[PDB]
Design a protein around this nucleic acid. Structure first.
Lengths: 223, 83, 129, 164, 142
RNA sequence: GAAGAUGAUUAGAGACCAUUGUAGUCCACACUGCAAACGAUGACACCCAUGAAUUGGGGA
RNA sequence: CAUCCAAAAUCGAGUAACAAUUGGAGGACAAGUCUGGUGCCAGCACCCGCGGUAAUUCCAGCUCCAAAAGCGUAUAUUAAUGC
C-alpha cells in the first residue's frame, strides 16, 4: 500500500521485528486497532477475503430517500484465525473497502480439539458451543472424522475459514435474515477458549507483556 | 499442559492465561482483563525488580469484585500485612 | 416442597460457580449428596467440604476452586445400560473427552467410565463437566 | 408371485442439486476420469458412506468388544485389497479418511491408462469395451471393475486382441 | 410445561391426543370428511364430460381473461371448473367430449388470478393436450 | 338516571350539550356467574447484589 | 444370454443418417447486457411476480444449463418440522 506510520505501540513493534506473530498480541490481551498489524505478521498466501453479503439499506427522508449499502467481510487463515467485519458506506466500493478494515481488527483465534480419536492435527471442534445474535442461535456439535462440514452453505464458508472440517449443526429461530446468522456463527467459534477444561489447567505461568519489555524502544520510537 | 496427540505433541496455537482469583481462562476477547505487575521491595527500600504478577479477569470489573480478590491474593503471599 | 434432594444442592453450586464464589452452603444433607461430591473431589474439581451436625439434618459447606462449569441433576433417574452409555454421553454433555455422567448401580456410586469397566449399567443420577 | 430375489439401489442423488459448489466438483471428476455420467460418481459415494457408517460405530466402542474385534479386521482387510489404504493402516480413522477419488482411481478405466496401455481415459474406456483387455487372463469388458493391488500388475491384453 | 414423573405416562398420551385436533395437518389425514369433500374421492385423477365453455375473469392486480371449462364428473355427479393450461387450446376442447381433470400445485388454496379453481385439464379424449399444442398428434373427431 | 319528553347545536341530530324523567340506583330474601375479574405475569420449593424509607411483632 | 466369423472353408460403420430426449435460463435455483413477434390482449406464473409498444419471465429462433435412456405432470405418504 501507501507508506504507513504507526500511531500504536503494537504497530511500531510489528514494523520492527519484536512482535513476530499474532499469538504474542493475543496471549496478553490487547486490542488490534490497525489492520496493518495483521498484514505484516500474517503474510498474504494464507489470508483470504470473501464478501458474505452486500445489500441496500434505505433511510427515509421527505420526498426522495437517501440510500446506502451494508456489507459483510469475512477473513482469516485455515490455521485457526477468523474475523468478521460489517460496515456501511453510501456506495458499493466504499462499504466493501471499509468492511475489510473492521474485519481484520475483529480477528480472534480458534481452538480445535478432537472427538476422542487422536491422529494428525485437529479436525474437530473441542466441545459443543453456541453463539447468539438476534433470535437465531447455532449449536455446533463435534463430529467423528470423515463427516465433512454438515451445515448450510452460509455457515459452511464460516467453518471452512476456521479450519473446522468435521461438524454437525442446527440452528433455531429466524435464519432467513442473513446478517444475524453470520455474527451468531462467529460468536460460537469464539466461545471455545471461553470455556475451562481439565487439559488446559495447570496454573500456567504468565510473563511480561511485549509492550513492557520493549518500553525503551517505544520511547525511542516516539522520538 | 494443553491438548496433545497420541504422539504427545502439542497442537494448540497458545495456552491462555489464568486469572488467579477465579481460576478461569482469560480470553483474548476480554480487554478488561488487566495484568497488574507490582515490584517487590527488600530491606533498605531496594527494588528486587518486577517479579510477582497478578492477572484479573474482565468479569471482575463489571461489578468491581476486583479489589476484594486482589487483597485475598496479596495477603496470602505476605505482600499486604494484616494484624 | 423439594421433590429431589440433588436439585436443591446443585443449583446452589452452579449459580455460585457462575458468580465465581469460592464457598457455597448447602441446606440439607443426604448419604447420596456426599458420594456425588466425593467423586468430583478425587478428579480435582473441589478443594474440600465439611458436613456440620445440627442433630436434625446436617448442613454441607463446600470449597469451590472454580474448576467446575456445571453440576446438573438428571431428575427422573432414567435407565441407562451397557450400550446406552454412548447415548447419554453424547446428548447431555458437550464432549466425550471430559464429560462425566455419574450413575447409581448396586455396586455403589460411580462415573460412567468405571461403570463400563465393571460392566454394570443402572439408573442415572447426575452429571458434571 | 413367489419371487425371493432382492432389489436394491446402489446410487442416489444428493439433496439440493442446483448447488454451484457441488456442480464444480462433479464436472471435475466426470471429465477428468472419463466417466459417462454423474450416476457413476454417486454409485461410489453410497458404498463409501456405507463403509464409513460401520467404522464410526465400531470406533465408538470400548476396547475388547466383539463387534470392534471381528468386524474391524474385515473393514481394514478389504481396503488393503484394492489398494485404497496400505498395510501401515489399522486405526479405523484411516478408513474415515477415504474420499470419492481414491475409489474412482482404482476402476479399470483409469488403471488401464495409468499402467501405460492407453493414451487417455476416454481411449482406455474403448479398449475395455472392444474386448481387448484382460485383468490377468480373464477378459473384462466392464470399466467399473475395481482392480486388486496384486492384479493391477498383470493387466496385459486379451488373447482375442489384434493388439495382443 | 410437562410432567417428568415415572407413572406420568397416561397424562402425556391423552394430552397429545387432544392437541392433534388443533392441527389441520392431522385432520387432513385421519378424517374422511376431507376425502368426501375432494371431488376425485382422493384419487389421482378423474374423468368428466364437458358441459359448457365458461369465460372467467381475473383478480384486480393482473387484468386478464382466462379460459375455463364447466365439466361434470362421472364418478360422483358433481360439477367443477377447470382451466385450459396451454395457449390457444380452447379449440381442442369441445362440448360433450370426455376429458380428464387433475389438480394443480397447492390443492387447499386456489391459484392466483383464477378464484375457486385448483383444477387443470391435462388430457382431452386421453390424448395428451400438450401433444396437440406442440404438434405431434392431431385431435381425433373419430 | 338508561328509555321517553322538550330546547338547542347541525346540511341532517333520542346526538355530544341544556331543562326534565321511568326502570334502575338503597335494603331484606331468592336467582344470574357473563368483566381490561389485569400484574394481560398459574400454584408450591431452592439459589441469587446495590441504597434509602415506610407498615406490624420481637430483641439491645 | 454366451462363444464365433474358419479349424481347410462363414458377415458387416465414417455425416460412424446405426443422427437422444424431456424440462429450464428475473428471484427462490444451475443457465441470456440476446434477435424477431405480441403489447395488461394472447398467455405465463406451486409462491414472489411478468404483459398498458423500452417484455432478462409471454409467443418463435439461436445460444447456454441440469439429468440422461430416461425426463416432466397429478395425488397420497415420509423427510424437511424443535409447525
Amino acid at each position: 500500500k501507501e507508506e504507513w506510520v504507526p500511531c500504536t505501540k503494537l504497530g511500531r513493534l510489528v514494523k520492527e521485528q519484536k512482535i513476530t506473530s499474532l499469538e504474542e498480541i493475543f496471549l496478553f490481551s490487547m486490542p488490534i486497532k490497525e489492520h496493518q498489524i495483521v498484514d505484516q505478521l500474517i503474510k498474504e498466501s494464507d489470508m483470504r477475503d470473501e464478501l458474505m453479503l452486500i445489500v441496500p439499506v434505505q433511510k427515509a427522508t421527505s420526498a426522495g430517500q437517501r440510500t446506502r449499502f451494508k456489507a459483510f467481510n469475512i477473513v482469516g487463515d485455515g490455521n485457526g484465525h477468523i474475523g468478521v467485519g460489517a460496515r456501511v458506506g453510501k456506495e458499493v466500493s466504499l462499504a466493501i473497502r471499509a468492511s475489510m478494515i473492521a474485519a481484520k481488527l475483529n480477528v480472534v483465534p480458534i481452538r480445535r480439539g478432537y472427538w476422542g480419536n487422536k491422529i494428525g492435527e485437529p479436525h474437530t471442534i473441542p466441545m459443543k458451543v453456541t453463539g447468539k445474535c438476534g433470535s437465531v442461535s447455532v449449536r455446533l456439535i463435534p463430529a467423528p472424522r470423515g463427516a465433512g462440514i454438515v451445515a448450510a452453505p452460509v455457515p459452511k464458508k464460516i467453518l471452512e475459514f476456521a479450519g473446522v472440517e468435521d461438524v454437525y449443526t442446527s440452528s433455531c429461530g429466524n435464519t432467513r435474515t442473513r446478517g444475524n446468522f453470520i455474527m451468531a456463527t462467529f460468536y460460537a467459534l469464539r466461545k471455545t477458549y471461553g470455556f475451562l477444561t481439565p487439559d488446559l489447567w495447570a496454573e500456567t505461568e504468565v510473563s511480561r507483556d511485549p509492550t513492557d519489555e520493549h518500553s525503551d524502544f517505544l520511547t525511542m520510537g516516539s522520538k | 499442559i494443553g491438548t496433545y496427540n497420541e504422539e504427545g505433541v502439542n497442537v494448540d496455537l497458545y495456552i491462555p492465561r489464568k486469572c488467579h482469583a477465579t481460576n478461569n481462562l482469560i480470553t483474548s476477547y476480554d480487554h478488561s482483563a488487566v495484568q497488574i505487575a507490582i515490584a517487590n521491595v527488600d530491606a533498605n527500600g531496594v527494588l528486587n525488580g518486577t517479579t510477582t504478577t497478578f492477572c484479573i479477569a474482565g468479569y471482575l470489573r463489571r461489578q468491581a469484585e476486583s479489589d476484594h480478590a486482589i487483597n485475598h491474593l496479596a495477603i496470602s503471599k505476605g505482600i499486604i500485612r494484616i494484624k | 416442597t423439594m421433590m429431589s434432594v440433588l436439585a436443591n444442592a446443585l443449583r446452589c453450586i452452579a449459580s455460585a460457580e457462575r458468580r465465581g464464589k469460592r464457598q457455597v452452603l448447602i441446606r440439607p444433607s443426604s448419604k447420596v449428596v456426599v458420594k456425588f461430591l466425593q467423586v468430583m473431589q478425587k478428579h480435582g474439581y473441589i478443594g474440600e467440604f465439611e458436613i456440620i451436625d445440627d442433630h436434625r439434618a446436617g448442613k454441607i459447606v463446600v470449597n469451590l476452586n472454580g474448576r467446575l462449569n456445571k453440576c446438573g441433576a438428571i431428575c427422573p433417574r432414567f435407565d441407562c445400560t451397557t450400550p446406552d452409555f454412548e447415548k447419554w454421553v453424547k446428548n447431555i454433555l458437550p464432549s466425550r473427552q471430559f464429560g462425566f455422567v455419574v450413575l447409581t448401580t448396586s455396586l455403589g456410586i460411580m462415573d460412567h467410565e468405571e461403570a463400563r469397566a465393571r460392566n454394570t449399567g443402572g439408573k442415572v443420577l447426575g452429571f458434571f463437566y | 408371485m413367489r419371487n425371493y430375489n432382492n432389489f436394491n439401489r446402489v446410487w442416489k442423488a444428493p439433496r439440493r442439486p442446483f448447488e454451484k459448489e457441488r456442480l464444480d466438483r462433479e464436472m471435475k471428476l466426470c471429465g477428468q476420469y472419463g466417466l459417462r455420467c454423474k450416476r457413476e460418481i454417486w454409485r461410489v459415494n453410497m458404498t463409501l458412506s456405507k463403509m464409513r457408517r460401520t467404522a464410526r460405530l465400531l470406533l465408538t466402542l470400548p476396547e475388547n468388544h466383539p463387534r470392534r474385534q471381528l468386524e474391524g479386521s474385515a473393514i481394514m482387510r478389504r481396503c488393503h485389497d484394492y489398494g485404497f489404504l496400505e498395510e501401515e493402516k489399522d486405526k479405523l480413522d484411516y478408513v474415515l479418511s477415504l474420499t470419492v477419488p481414491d475409489i474412482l482411481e482404482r476402476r479399470l478405466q483409469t488403471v488401464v491408462f495409468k499402467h501405460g496401455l492407453a493414451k487417455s481415459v476416454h481411449h482406455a474406456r474403448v479398449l475395455i469395451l472392444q474386448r481387448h483387455i484382460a485383468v490377468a487372463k480373464q477378459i473384462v469388458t466392464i470399466p467399473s471393475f475395481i482392480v486388486r493391488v496384486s492384479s493391477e500388475h498383470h493387466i496385459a491384453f486379451a488373447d482375442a486382441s489384434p493388439f495382443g | 410445561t410437562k410432567a417428568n414423573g415415572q407413572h406420568a405416562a397416561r397424562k402425556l398420551v391423552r394430552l397429545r391426543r387432544k392437541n392433534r385436533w388443533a392441527d389441520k395437518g392431522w385432520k387432513k389425514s385421519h378424517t374422511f370428511v376431507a376425502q368426501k369433500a375432494n371431488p376425485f374421492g382422493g384419487s389421482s385423477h378423474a374423468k368428466g364430460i364437458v358441459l359448457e365453455k365458461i369465460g372467467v375473469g381475473a383478480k384486480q392486480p393482473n387484468s386478464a381473461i382466462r379460459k375455463c371449462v364447466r365439466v361434470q364428473l362421472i364418478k360422483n355427479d358433481k360439477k367443477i371448473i377447470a382451466f385450459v393450461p396451454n395457449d390457444g387450446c380452447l379449440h381442442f376442447i369441445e362440448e360433450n367430449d370426455e376429458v380428464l381433470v387433475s389438480g394443480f400445485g397447492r390443492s387447499g388454496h386456489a391459484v392466483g388470478d383464477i378464484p375457486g379453481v385448483r383444477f387443470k385439464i391435462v388430457k382431452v379424449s386421453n390424448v395428451g393436450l400438450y401433444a396437440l399444442y406442440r404438434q405431434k398428434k392431431e385431435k381425433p373427431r373419430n
